[PDB]
Write a protein that binds this DNA or RNA. Sequence first.
RNA 1: CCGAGGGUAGGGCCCGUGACUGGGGCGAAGUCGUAACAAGGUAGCUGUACCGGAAGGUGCGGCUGGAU
RNA 2: UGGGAGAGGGUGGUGGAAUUCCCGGAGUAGCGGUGAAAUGCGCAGAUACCGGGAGGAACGCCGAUGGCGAAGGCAGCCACCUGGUCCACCCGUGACGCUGAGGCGCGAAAGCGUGGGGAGCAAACCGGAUUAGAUACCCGGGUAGUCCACGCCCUAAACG
RNA 3: CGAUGUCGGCUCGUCGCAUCCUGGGGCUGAAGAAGGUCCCAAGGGUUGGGCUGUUCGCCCAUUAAAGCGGCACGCGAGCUG
RNA 4: GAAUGCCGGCAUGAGUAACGAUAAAGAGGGUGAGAAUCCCUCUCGCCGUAAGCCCAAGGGUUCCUACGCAAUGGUCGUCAGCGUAGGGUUAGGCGGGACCUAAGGUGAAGCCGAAAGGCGUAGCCGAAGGGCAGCCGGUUAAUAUUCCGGCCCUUCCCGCAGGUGCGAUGGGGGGACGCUCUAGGCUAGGGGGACCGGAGCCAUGGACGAGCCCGGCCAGAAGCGCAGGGUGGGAGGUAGGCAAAUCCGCCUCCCAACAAGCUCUGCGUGGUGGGGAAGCCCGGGUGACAACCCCCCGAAGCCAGGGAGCCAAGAAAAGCCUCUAAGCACAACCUGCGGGAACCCGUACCGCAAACCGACACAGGUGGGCGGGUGCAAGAGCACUCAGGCGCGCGGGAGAACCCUCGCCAAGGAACUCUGCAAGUUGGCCCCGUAACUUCGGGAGAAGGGGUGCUCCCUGGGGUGAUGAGCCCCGGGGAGCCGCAGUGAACAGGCUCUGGCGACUGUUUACCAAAAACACAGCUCUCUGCGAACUCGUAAGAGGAGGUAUAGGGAGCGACGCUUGCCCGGUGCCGGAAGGUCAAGGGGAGGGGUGCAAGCCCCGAACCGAAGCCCCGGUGAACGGCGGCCGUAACUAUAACGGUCCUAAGGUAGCGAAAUUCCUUGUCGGGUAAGUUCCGACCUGCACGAAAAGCGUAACGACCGGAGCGCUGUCUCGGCGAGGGACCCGGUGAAAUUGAACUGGCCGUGAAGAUGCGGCCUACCCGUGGCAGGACGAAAAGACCCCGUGGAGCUUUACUGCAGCC
RNA 5: GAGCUAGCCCUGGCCAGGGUGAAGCUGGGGUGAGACCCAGUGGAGGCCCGAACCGGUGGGGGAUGCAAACCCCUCGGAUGA
Lengths: 275, 48
Amino acid sequence: AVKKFKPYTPSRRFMTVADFSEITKTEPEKSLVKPLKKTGGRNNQGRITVRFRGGGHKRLYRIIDFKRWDKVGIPAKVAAIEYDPNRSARIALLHYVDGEKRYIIAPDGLQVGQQVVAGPDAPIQVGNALPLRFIPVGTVVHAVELEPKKGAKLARAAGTSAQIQGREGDYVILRLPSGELRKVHGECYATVGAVGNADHKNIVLGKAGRSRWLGRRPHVRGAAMNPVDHPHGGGEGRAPRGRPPASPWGWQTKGLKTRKRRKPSSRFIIARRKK
Amino acid sequence: MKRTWQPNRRKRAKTHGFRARMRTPGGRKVLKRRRQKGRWRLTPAVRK
RNA sequence: CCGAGGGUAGGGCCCGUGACUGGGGCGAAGUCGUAACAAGGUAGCUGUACCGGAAGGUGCGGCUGGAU
RNA sequence: UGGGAGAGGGUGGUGGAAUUCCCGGAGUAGCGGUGAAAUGCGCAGAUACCGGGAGGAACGCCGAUGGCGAAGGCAGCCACCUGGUCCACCCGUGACGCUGAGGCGCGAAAGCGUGGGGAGCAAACCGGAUUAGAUACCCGGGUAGUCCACGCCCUAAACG
RNA sequence: CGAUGUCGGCUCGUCGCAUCCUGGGGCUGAAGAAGGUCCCAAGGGUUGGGCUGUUCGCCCAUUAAAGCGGCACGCGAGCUG
RNA sequence: GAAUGCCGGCAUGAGUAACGAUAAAGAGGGUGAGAAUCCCUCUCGCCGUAAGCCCAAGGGUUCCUACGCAAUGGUCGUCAGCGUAGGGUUAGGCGGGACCUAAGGUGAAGCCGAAAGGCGUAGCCGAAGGGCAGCCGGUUAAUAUUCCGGCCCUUCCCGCAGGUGCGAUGGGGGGACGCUCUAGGCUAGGGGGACCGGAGCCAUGGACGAGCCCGGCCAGAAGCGCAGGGUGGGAGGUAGGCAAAUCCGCCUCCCAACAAGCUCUGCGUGGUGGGGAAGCCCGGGUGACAACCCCCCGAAGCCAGGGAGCCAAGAAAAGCCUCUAAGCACAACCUGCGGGAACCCGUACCGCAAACCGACACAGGUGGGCGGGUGCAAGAGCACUCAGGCGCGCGGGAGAACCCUCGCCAAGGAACUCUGCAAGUUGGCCCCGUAACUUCGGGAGAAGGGGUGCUCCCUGGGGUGAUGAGCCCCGGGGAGCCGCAGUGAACAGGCUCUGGCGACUGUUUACCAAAAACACAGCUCUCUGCGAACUCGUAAGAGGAGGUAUAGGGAGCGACGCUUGCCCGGUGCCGGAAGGUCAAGGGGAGGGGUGCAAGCCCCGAACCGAAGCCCCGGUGAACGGCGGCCGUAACUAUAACGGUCCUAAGGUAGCGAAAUUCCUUGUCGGGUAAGUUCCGACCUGCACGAAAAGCGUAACGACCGGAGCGCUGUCUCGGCGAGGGACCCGGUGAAAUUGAACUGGCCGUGAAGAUGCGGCCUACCCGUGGCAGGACGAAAAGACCCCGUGGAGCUUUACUGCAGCC
RNA sequence: GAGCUAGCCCUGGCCAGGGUGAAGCUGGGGUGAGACCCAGUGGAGGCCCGAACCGGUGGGGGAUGCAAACCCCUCGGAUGA
Ligand SMILES: [K+]
Ligand SMILES: [Mg+2]
Ligand SMILES: [Mg+2]
Ligand SMILES: [Mg+2]
Ligand SMILES: [Mg+2]
Ligand SMILES: [Mg+2]
Ligand SMILES: [Mg+2]
Ligand SMILES: [Mg+2]
Ligand SMILES: [Mg+2]
Ligand SMILES: [Mg+2]
Ligand SMILES: [Mg+2]
Ligand SMILES: [Mg+2]
Ligand SMILES: [Mg+2]
Ligand SMILES: [Mg+2]
Ligand SMILES: [Mg+2]
Ligand SMILES: [Mg+2]
Ligand SMILES: [Mg+2]
Ligand SMILES: [Mg+2]
Ligand SMILES: [Mg+2]
Ligand SMILES: [Mg+2]
Ligand SMILES: [Mg+2]
Ligand SMILES: [Mg+2]
Ligand SMILES: [Mg+2]
Ligand SMILES: [Mg+2]
Ligand SMILES: [Mg+2]
Ligand SMILES: [Mg+2]
Ligand SMILES: [Mg+2]
Ligand SMILES: [Mg+2]
Ligand SMILES: [Mg+2]
Ligand SMILES: [Mg+2]
Ligand SMILES: [Mg+2]
Ligand SMILES: [Mg+2]
Ligand SMILES: [Mg+2]
Ligand SMILES: [Mg+2]
Ligand SMILES: [Mg+2]
Ligand SMILES: [Mg+2]
Ligand SMILES: [Mg+2]
Ligand SMILES: [Mg+2]
Ligand SMILES: [Mg+2]
Ligand SMILES: [Mg+2]
Ligand SMILES: [Mg+2]
Ligand SMILES: [Mg+2]
Ligand SMILES: [Mg+2]
Ligand SMILES: [Mg+2]
Ligand SMILES: [Mg+2]
Ligand SMILES: [Mg+2]
Ligand SMILES: [Mg+2]
Ligand SMILES: [Mg+2]
Ligand SMILES: [Mg+2]
Ligand SMILES: [Mg+2]
Ligand SMILES: [Mg+2]
Ligand SMILES: [Mg+2]
Ligand SMILES: [Mg+2]
Ligand SMILES: [Mg+2]
Ligand SMILES: [Mg+2]
Ligand SMILES: [Mg+2]
Ligand SMILES: [Mg+2]
Ligand SMILES: [Mg+2]
Ligand SMILES: [Mg+2]
Ligand SMILES: [Mg+2]
Ligand SMILES: [Mg+2]
Ligand SMILES: [Mg+2]
Ligand SMILES: [Mg+2]
Ligand SMILES: [Mg+2]
Ligand SMILES: [Mg+2]
Ligand SMILES: [Mg+2]
Ligand SMILES: [Mg+2]
Ligand SMILES: [Mg+2]
Ligand SMILES: [Mg+2]
Ligand SMILES: [Mg+2]
Ligand SMILES: [Mg+2]
Ligand SMILES: [Mg+2]
Ligand SMILES: [Mg+2]
Ligand SMILES: [Mg+2]
Ligand SMILES: [Mg+2]
Ligand SMILES: [Mg+2]
Ligand SMILES: [Mg+2]
Ligand SMILES: [Mg+2]
Ligand SMILES: [Mg+2]
Ligand SMILES: [Mg+2]
Ligand SMILES: [Mg+2]
Ligand SMILES: [Mg+2]
Ligand SMILES: [Mg+2]
Ligand SMILES: [Mg+2]
Ligand SMILES: [Mg+2]
Ligand SMILES: [Mg+2]
Ligand SMILES: [Mg+2]
Ligand SMILES: [Mg+2]
Ligand SMILES: [Mg+2]
Ligand SMILES: [Mg+2]
Ligand SMILES: [Mg+2]
Ligand SMILES: [Mg+2]
Ligand SMILES: [Mg+2]
Ligand SMILES: [Mg+2]
Ligand SMILES: [Mg+2]
Ligand SMILES: [Mg+2]
Ligand SMILES: [Mg+2]
Ligand SMILES: [Mg+2]
Ligand SMILES: [Mg+2]
Ligand SMILES: [Mg+2]
Ligand SMILES: [Mg+2]
Ligand SMILES: [Mg+2]
Ligand SMILES: [Mg+2]
Ligand SMILES: [Mg+2]
Ligand SMILES: [Mg+2]
Ligand SMILES: [Mg+2]
Ligand SMILES: [Mg+2]
Ligand SMILES: [Mg+2]
Ligand SMILES: [Mg+2]
Ligand SMILES: [Mg+2]
Ligand SMILES: [Mg+2]
Ligand SMILES: [Mg+2]
Ligand SMILES: [Mg+2]
Ligand SMILES: [Mg+2]
Ligand SMILES: [Mg+2]
Ligand SMILES: [Mg+2]
Ligand SMILES: [Mg+2]
Ligand SMILES: [Mg+2]
Ligand SMILES: [Mg+2]
Ligand SMILES: [Mg+2]
Ligand SMILES: [Mg+2]
Ligand SMILES: [Mg+2]
Ligand SMILES: [Mg+2]
Ligand SMILES: [Mg+2]
Ligand SMILES: [Mg+2]
Ligand SMILES: [Mg+2]
Ligand SMILES: [Mg+2]
Ligand SMILES: [Mg+2]
Ligand SMILES: [Mg+2]
Ligand SMILES: [Mg+2]
Ligand SMILES: [Mg+2]
Ligand SMILES: [Mg+2]
Ligand SMILES: [Mg+2]
Ligand SMILES: [Mg+2]
Ligand SMILES: [Mg+2]
Ligand SMILES: [Mg+2]
Ligand SMILES: [Mg+2]
Ligand SMILES: [Mg+2]
Ligand SMILES: [Mg+2]
Ligand SMILES: [Mg+2]
Ligand SMILES: [Mg+2]
Ligand SMILES: [Mg+2]
Ligand SMILES: [Mg+2]
Ligand SMILES: [Mg+2]
Ligand SMILES: [Mg+2]
Ligand SMILES: [Mg+2]
Ligand SMILES: [Mg+2]
Ligand SMILES: [Mg+2]
Ligand SMILES: [Mg+2]
Ligand SMILES: [Mg+2]
Ligand SMILES: [Mg+2]
Ligand SMILES: [Mg+2]
Ligand SMILES: [Mg+2]
Ligand SMILES: [Mg+2]
Ligand SMILES: [Mg+2]
Ligand SMILES: [Mg+2]
Ligand SMILES: [Mg+2]
Ligand SMILES: [Mg+2]
Ligand SMILES: [Mg+2]
Ligand SMILES: [Mg+2]
Ligand SMILES: [Mg+2]
Ligand SMILES: [Mg+2]
Ligand SMILES: [Mg+2]
Ligand SMILES: [Mg+2]
Ligand SMILES: [Mg+2]
Ligand SMILES: [Mg+2]
Ligand SMILES: [Mg+2]
Ligand SMILES: [Mg+2]
Ligand SMILES: [Mg+2]
Ligand SMILES: [Mg+2]
Ligand SMILES: [Mg+2]
Ligand SMILES: [Mg+2]
Ligand SMILES: [Mg+2]
Ligand SMILES: [Mg+2]
Ligand SMILES: [Mg+2]
Ligand SMILES: [Mg+2]
Ligand SMILES: [Mg+2]
Ligand SMILES: [Mg+2]
Ligand SMILES: [Mg+2]
Ligand SMILES: [Mg+2]
Ligand SMILES: [Mg+2]
Ligand SMILES: [Mg+2]
Ligand SMILES: [Mg+2]
Ligand SMILES: [Mg+2]
Ligand SMILES: [Mg+2]
Ligand SMILES: [Mg+2]
Ligand SMILES: [Mg+2]
Ligand SMILES: [Mg+2]
Ligand SMILES: [Mg+2]
Ligand SMILES: [Mg+2]
Ligand SMILES: [Mg+2]
Ligand SMILES: [Mg+2]
Ligand SMILES: [Mg+2]
Ligand SMILES: [Mg+2]
Ligand SMILES: [Mg+2]
Ligand SMILES: [Mg+2]
Ligand SMILES: [Mg+2]
Ligand SMILES: [Mg+2]
Ligand SMILES: [Mg+2]
Ligand SMILES: [Mg+2]
Ligand SMILES: [Mg+2]
Ligand SMILES: [Mg+2]
Ligand SMILES: [Mg+2]
Ligand SMILES: [Mg+2]
Ligand SMILES: [Mg+2]
Ligand SMILES: [Mg+2]
Ligand SMILES: [Mg+2]
Ligand SMILES: [Mg+2]
Ligand SMILES: [Mg+2]
Ligand SMILES: [Mg+2]
Ligand SMILES: [Mg+2]
Ligand SMILES: [Mg+2]
Ligand SMILES: [Mg+2]
Ligand SMILES: [Mg+2]
Ligand SMILES: [Mg+2]
Ligand SMILES: [Mg+2]
Ligand SMILES: [Mg+2]
Ligand SMILES: [Mg+2]
Ligand SMILES: [Mg+2]
Ligand SMILES: [Mg+2]
Ligand SMILES: [Mg+2]
Ligand SMILES: [Mg+2]
Ligand SMILES: [Mg+2]
Ligand SMILES: [Mg+2]
Ligand SMILES: [Mg+2]
Ligand SMILES: [Mg+2]
Ligand SMILES: [Mg+2]
Ligand SMILES: [Mg+2]
Ligand SMILES: [Mg+2]
Ligand SMILES: [Mg+2]
Ligand SMILES: [Mg+2]
Ligand SMILES: [Mg+2]
Ligand SMILES: [Mg+2]
Ligand SMILES: [Mg+2]
Ligand SMILES: [Mg+2]
Ligand SMILES: [Mg+2]
Ligand SMILES: [Mg+2]
Ligand SMILES: [Mg+2]
Ligand SMILES: [Mg+2]
Ligand SMILES: [Mg+2]
Ligand SMILES: [Mg+2]
Ligand SMILES: [Mg+2]
Ligand SMILES: [Mg+2]
Ligand SMILES: [Mg+2]
Ligand SMILES: [Mg+2]
Ligand SMILES: [Mg+2]
Ligand SMILES: [Mg+2]
Ligand SMILES: [Mg+2]
Ligand SMILES: [Mg+2]
Ligand SMILES: [Mg+2]
Ligand SMILES: [Mg+2]
Ligand SMILES: [Mg+2]
Ligand SMILES: [Mg+2]
Ligand SMILES: [Mg+2]
Ligand SMILES: [Mg+2]
Ligand SMILES: [Mg+2]
Ligand SMILES: [Mg+2]
Ligand SMILES: [Mg+2]
Ligand SMILES: [Mg+2]
Ligand SMILES: [Mg+2]
Ligand SMILES: [Mg+2]
Ligand SMILES: [Mg+2]
Ligand SMILES: [Mg+2]
Ligand SMILES: [Mg+2]
Ligand SMILES: [Mg+2]
């Protein structure tokens, strides 16, 4: 439940923050953090390759377990739910009976004190991870591997989920977060439940400083530039596009499909996305 | 006001020094040419 | 000291008035159409919403104060 | 105290019919629509038929001149939670009652905010007809909305 | 065009007269007073404000009068901008 | 002889501008050939969150001393950061290295690239970050945490003793972390004392005093005291920490839990070693057996890895502790003590500046620490002052114009002007009080006002302390005193109403624009299923992202409110397994060259044959576009209504003479004596209009309009005064410019604006201070304009290519 | 050539003093329970005033300068993009 503020500065009038109420531990597990190398959007040439990045708060990376099939049948206790600044979802700290400690992303409804488990025989419970073939059709599910043993790839952001819709040979049909209908192999693991912190989307950054705290530097409209800079640059006074709206690099940006045509995975996408 | 020359001994040796020149085709030509020209110093002096 | 009152400043209430503007009432024989009264020729009325020169029309839900 | 009837309310779940769309099959010259038509759809293979699937909304028969609620209103089925109510017995308290300016709560539809949902229907809007006109009636489309949650709105031929 | 800085304002003047006022006149459809019209006359004088960058113009309040032009549309090695 | 030619020399301007902050000088005495300028003394002024002191960077002998004055020094010079010479920088503990890792760089493995080379895991490099053992004083002309003294300490090597399963680049713990706020206890620092020590002093009317003036400490090992940080103990199980593991992790049980214990810092004390003022006398000697005590204020520093809250969620690696593996347990490690060993580089001096960056001894620029006192509500503000450092390397006069900075001004008060530009006004604190409107925060310091010094009396609370005295902090009342005036000096908003634009704080044309421009939360469209899209790269490889549709890219719009209409014919994009065209290729009807012929060779029709295009549809917060003429109502006028032509469709709501209105100063209303501006209206909108968004909107703005109050030298209309210059004298001494000049006025003439020609007029020779009309004055081979088959940036349905994509 | 300048990465440092007084917390009231109101506590914020520090609004000076962008007065930000 996003927390509002009283309008005692111009920016606090609309600013909302997360409530953080699901959080029970407030400093990470030392043995699971490592430094996140901030890039500024610069590749190994020093060149900006993603404009307007840099200058956000320092973060340590929490190592997350996106496999979960390294420890089939070994149950864990959910020890804490922690803030993770490297993702929208909250993370859940797991204590295995091994003694081994691991982070998964916190599904919605997961409660501190409960047990989760992974494997072909796991109960169908929020927190548990199975290969797709063993999860009953209809199940809402997240952190879905896209190819067997390659790691959880789909439905990881706050609030997202995939639904199992049917089966077909070695593959199951998923409705992905985007609406796309896609075959995913049955041996691919998924975790029962939707990703938590679904109120994330309703946060109102409130002021430009907040974007700056996240490493987002101001975005400059091509219409604010000169012709040397942008297709939309120039013109005395303000100016409409005066050509099909285009990117800095010339390509059209209203409707132009950009998925490579002859992509081998097209054989597996049933229906392109919705809405 | 703030002028353009802001001396810095480490910056001077690391940018124009002998070892920066030898690590690069262009810099080794800079050394080749200043030798042929008979320069008394091949490289800027910095006291280290 | 208080003190009629005078002066500086700021409020509140009422009355008059104002380019222009809003609809309202009324006015023997103007223009447009025909919404209602008969099943009034699409039963009417209705609260709301949207639209239209105008009456009105349409959607939703309601009423019979509707006919056959 | 013992019993009862009930679409009374809230939450969770869940069933079959039908529509639409999608996929496969089979098939070909029209389908659709009206007062009649036209627009529209269809040889790029529509309609009609079979199979598979997705999804939303409403629950046929029972069903009634029926039932429940203070009203607005409430109808597939299951469970949970919860209200009102009637009857019996004549057991308990001993007038503890009636109404009720204010206050407070509830309040059909439509509408509004933030999300979600969107099959069918359908303001607006587009087109085809009709007509002197037709910003209508009829026809083909079609967006809000209609549905969910939370928060507002507080209206009514909210009527007996 | 190997540069003659370009509007207006300010300052500072100076000149012409086709004279706005003051002086001298003739004619008058000049009773008087006030005017009209032309002639002579450049000695001096020719206001303060509102609007607009404005020149100009209109307006307000005066005045004997609120004149028109030249001087690189006088004057930026004088100022403004 | 010319090339705004080249190099050099020397002129002119000219004894002219200037001599570099307006913090400021005067005298006496020295020295010396020579003195405003060097030295000494006394007087005066300036800085004092520095204009003082200590670091770092940079500089590189400039440091100290003797001897010098040609040049350098904006004058002088005997002086100097100058010339010559000699001397000067001393570390196991400070800084860096023989330690660690950060970005990044490099790079065995490996990958890619015509060559050069580009990547790249580990590893290595890499510091102002981690880690690590020295404090106080003395001494030199010049170094000192370095030499000396006193007291402390670290590592390594060897030994002795005691102890133990010893052993690692491997496992684990720890190191190890943000912002804001902040408790307790200290210290640094500072105030006061009638207490202790001190050379002295009594002035000029008074004071021999509880008088004046001066000082009253610093370091310190073990121990102890105080304040804090860190940390549970035991046992059993064990599959995890890429071998092992008694470690750590996880489960269970028992004892302890604001604690205690153990441990580590800080502070106090502490054997001991130091220091020690004014004044007097000549850096030193005295003072001095110096004293070295008490009270108060008190950090932003310390205890610290403290506490709380919050969201944007806050390095790593070594040292260190523990665990074990090879091994080895005659070793080895831990502990205590002893002896020995302990290397390299820096160390001078300037360091907000005359030694650094600015060509200069240049009003500029330069990171960190200390930065005292009193008063002003506070403070690093402001005034004055301490310690300390300076008077800014030309001076002396004069007291013109004019310029600069400054002060005052009668009456008026914006009449100035494009504009109240500028300058006044206001001004801190306390109290009273405060409107429209609003998003309920605000508007608000609204506005407007009253108070403010000093004395005496009564009196309230708090801190320290003891619950008291004292010290210290926050107040309440009463009675009075003085002046023109009490934030008495310095520092310290003018205010209001009403429009436009942009919500807002931010950002920008370094050096003519700070804005209405950019950004911005937020809204929408669109792409993207992950080896994503997109971006850089030939590639490998990166970024995106160790992210995954509540995510990421691209685009427009720009908080918020109410909204965003109609057109898909053209262009774009999206969809369409049909049809039409369509390249290489497939096919080979049918030819042709040649050869005796088998053959060899060349052409080649139908037909099959992709993307693209055509074609069929969709699509506007895609590119874009959203009509004309004529007629019509019972006064007139005007047309709700009609006719017709055209369109893909004819602009809706809202707004409108506008940041848009040409005619225009439209018209009417308001404000004014007067209003081309302003405000409110009207609507024939030359030429608004709905995310190149439309109409609004509280708050906000060094934005741009209009008005009023207050107040003024802006002005009527100027006067006086101050200082720095200008001016005169001594010293030093430029500059652009310059065909040569013996260089007047008019009226003419002349290539059409003449000192230079003609006629006339006027005019003795040479300067100084001033003014700018001319020398078509200087400057810059006009930026405008044109010309050149000159160039460059940019655009596109110009041409032709290429990357990229199909 | 990024010792100027623009952006980013890593690691450090800096921001006197004063004002305003959000959430929360506690208590009181309120109710069936609530929302809610009130007081105290609290200490939020691209909050307010103002030095350092960062700026460069207006005017004046300067214009062969002290300076190839400076000086004086005035003005913006000053816990944050
Ligand atoms: K031009
Ligand atoms: Mg809020
Ligand atoms: Mg509010
Ligand atoms: Mg949470
Ligand atoms: Mg770690
Ligand atoms: Mg990275
Ligand atoms: Mg790299
Ligand atoms: Mg990019
Ligand atoms: Mg970037
Ligand atoms: Mg999170
Ligand atoms: Mg993310
Ligand atoms: Mg798969
Ligand atoms: Mg969130
Ligand atoms: Mg969102
Ligand atoms: Mg961030
Ligand atoms: Mg953004
Ligand atoms: Mg932008
Ligand atoms: Mg532009
Ligand atoms: Mg531009
Ligand atoms: Mg460029
Ligand atoms: Mg280009
Ligand atoms: Mg371009
Ligand atoms: Mg353009
Ligand atoms: Mg433009
Ligand atoms: Mg334009
Ligand atoms: Mg532009
Ligand atoms: Mg425009
Ligand atoms: Mg265009
Ligand atoms: Mg384009
Ligand atoms: Mg592309
Ligand atoms: Mg898809
Ligand atoms: Mg600079
Ligand atoms: Mg600076
Ligand atoms: Mg530098
Ligand atoms: Mg250096
Ligand atoms: Mg360096
Ligand atoms: Mg450097
Ligand atoms: Mg380099
Ligand atoms: Mg080098
Ligand atoms: Mg080479
Ligand atoms: Mg070579
Ligand atoms: Mg040389
Ligand atoms: Mg040599
Ligand atoms: Mg070199
Ligand atoms: Mg009707
Ligand atoms: Mg009728
Ligand atoms: Mg009818
Ligand atoms: Mg209609
Ligand atoms: Mg057909
Ligand atoms: Mg066919
Ligand atoms: Mg669906
Ligand atoms: Mg009874
Ligand atoms: Mg009884
Ligand atoms: Mg209702
Ligand atoms: Mg039609
Ligand atoms: Mg007809
Ligand atoms: Mg719909
Ligand atoms: Mg009824
Ligand atoms: Mg010319
Ligand atoms: Mg010339
Ligand atoms: Mg010219
Ligand atoms: Mg010239
Ligand atoms: Mg004037
Ligand atoms: Mg006369
Ligand atoms: Mg005259
Ligand atoms: Mg005259
Ligand atoms: Mg005028
Ligand atoms: Mg003119
Ligand atoms: Mg005019
Ligand atoms: Mg004239
Ligand atoms: Mg003339
Ligand atoms: Mg002319
Ligand atoms: Mg003219
Ligand atoms: Mg002129
Ligand atoms: Mg002129
Ligand atoms: Mg000028
Ligand atoms: Mg002029
Ligand atoms: Mg001139
Ligand atoms: Mg001239
Ligand atoms: Mg010649
Ligand atoms: Mg020559
Ligand atoms: Mg030449
Ligand atoms: Mg020459
Ligand atoms: Mg020579
Ligand atoms: Mg020469
Ligand atoms: Mg010479
Ligand atoms: Mg000569
Ligand atoms: Mg001379
Ligand atoms: Mg001389
Ligand atoms: Mg001269
Ligand atoms: Mg000069
Ligand atoms: Mg000078
Ligand atoms: Mg000079
Ligand atoms: Mg000064
Ligand atoms: Mg003097
Ligand atoms: Mg003297
Ligand atoms: Mg001298
Ligand atoms: Mg001398
Ligand atoms: Mg001296
Ligand atoms: Mg004396
Ligand atoms: Mg001081
Ligand atoms: Mg030097
Ligand atoms: Mg000399
Ligand atoms: Mg001499
Ligand atoms: Mg000399
Ligand atoms: Mg000599
Ligand atoms: Mg000299
Ligand atoms: Mg000099
Ligand atoms: Mg001498
Ligand atoms: Mg020399
Ligand atoms: Mg020395
Ligand atoms: Mg030592
Ligand atoms: Mg060292
Ligand atoms: Mg060694
Ligand atoms: Mg290196
Ligand atoms: Mg190193
Ligand atoms: Mg270091
Ligand atoms: Mg020590
Ligand atoms: Mg000596
Ligand atoms: Mg051991
Ligand atoms: Mg840690
Ligand atoms: Mg950490
Ligand atoms: Mg750190
Ligand atoms: Mg915070
Ligand atoms: Mg101490
Ligand atoms: Mg003190
Ligand atoms: Mg084990
Ligand atoms: Mg410590
Ligand atoms: Mg003695
Ligand atoms: Mg501090
Ligand atoms: Mg600490
Ligand atoms: Mg802490
Ligand atoms: Mg590392
Ligand atoms: Mg062994
Ligand atoms: Mg042995
Ligand atoms: Mg041991
Ligand atoms: Mg060595
Ligand atoms: Mg050495
Ligand atoms: Mg030294
Ligand atoms: Mg300075
Ligand atoms: Mg400094
Ligand atoms: Mg110096
Ligand atoms: Mg230079
Ligand atoms: Mg020089
Ligand atoms: Mg000097
Ligand atoms: Mg200097
Ligand atoms: Mg002191
Ligand atoms: Mg104060
Ligand atoms: Mg001086
Ligand atoms: Mg000075
Ligand atoms: Mg004189
Ligand atoms: Mg001055
Ligand atoms: Mg005065
Ligand atoms: Mg006076
Ligand atoms: Mg006056
Ligand atoms: Mg006045
Ligand atoms: Mg007045
Ligand atoms: Mg005015
Ligand atoms: Mg102006
Ligand atoms: Mg003041
Ligand atoms: Mg008011
Ligand atoms: Mg009010
Ligand atoms: Mg107001
Ligand atoms: Mg208002
Ligand atoms: Mg309010
Ligand atoms: Mg006040
Ligand atoms: Mg008083
Ligand atoms: Mg007094
Ligand atoms: Mg008195
Ligand atoms: Mg102020
Ligand atoms: Mg702006
Ligand atoms: Mg703005
Ligand atoms: Mg706007
Ligand atoms: Mg706004
Ligand atoms: Mg905005
Ligand atoms: Mg700010
Ligand atoms: Mg600029
Ligand atoms: Mg510029
Ligand atoms: Mg420029
Ligand atoms: Mg420039
Ligand atoms: Mg400027
Ligand atoms: Mg600004
Ligand atoms: Mg901009
Ligand atoms: Mg904005
Ligand atoms: Mg928006
Ligand atoms: Mg959206
Ligand atoms: Mg590329
Ligand atoms: Mg190549
Ligand atoms: Mg990555
Ligand atoms: Mg996104
Ligand atoms: Mg913008
Ligand atoms: Mg815009
Ligand atoms: Mg179109
Ligand atoms: Mg179309
Ligand atoms: Mg189209
Ligand atoms: Mg167009
Ligand atoms: Mg068009
Ligand atoms: Mg509309
Ligand atoms: Mg208009
Ligand atoms: Mg307008
Ligand atoms: Mg405009
Ligand atoms: Mg217009
Ligand atoms: Mg106009
Ligand atoms: Mg005009
Ligand atoms: Mg007018
Ligand atoms: Mg008027
Ligand atoms: Mg009009
Ligand atoms: Mg228009
Ligand atoms: Mg546009
Ligand atoms: Mg507004
Ligand atoms: Mg509003
Ligand atoms: Mg506003
Ligand atoms: Mg602003
Ligand atoms: Mg502004
Ligand atoms: Mg005014
Ligand atoms: Mg006024
Ligand atoms: Mg004056
Ligand atoms: Mg004077
Ligand atoms: Mg003389
Ligand atoms: Mg001389
Ligand atoms: Mg000289
Ligand atoms: Mg000559
Ligand atoms: Mg001559
Ligand atoms: Mg002459
Ligand atoms: Mg002459
Ligand atoms: Mg001529
Ligand atoms: Mg002439
Ligand atoms: Mg002559
Ligand atoms: Mg002659
Ligand atoms: Mg002649
Ligand atoms: Mg002559
Ligand atoms: Mg002559
Ligand atoms: Mg003459
Ligand atoms: Mg002279
Ligand atoms: Mg002169
Ligand atoms: Mg002249
Ligand atoms: Mg002149
Ligand atoms: Mg002059
Ligand atoms: Mg000439
Ligand atoms: Mg001239
Ligand atoms: Mg001239
Ligand atoms: Mg020039
Ligand atoms: Mg040239
Ligand atoms: Mg030229
Ligand atoms: Mg030129
Ligand atoms: Mg040009
Ligand atoms: Mg031309
Ligand atoms: Mg040509
Ligand atoms: Mg030609
Ligand atoms: Mg050309
Ligand atoms: Mg600050
Ligand atoms: Mg308070
Ligand atoms: Mg709290
Ligand atoms: Mg602030
Ligand atoms: Mg304030
Ligand atoms: Mg300035
Ligand atoms: Mg600056
Ligand atoms: Mg000013
Ligand atoms: Mg000048
Ligand atoms: Mg200049
Ligand atoms: Mg300055
Ligand atoms: Mg100032
Ligand atoms: Mg200020
Ligand atoms: Mg501050
Ligand atoms: Mg401020």
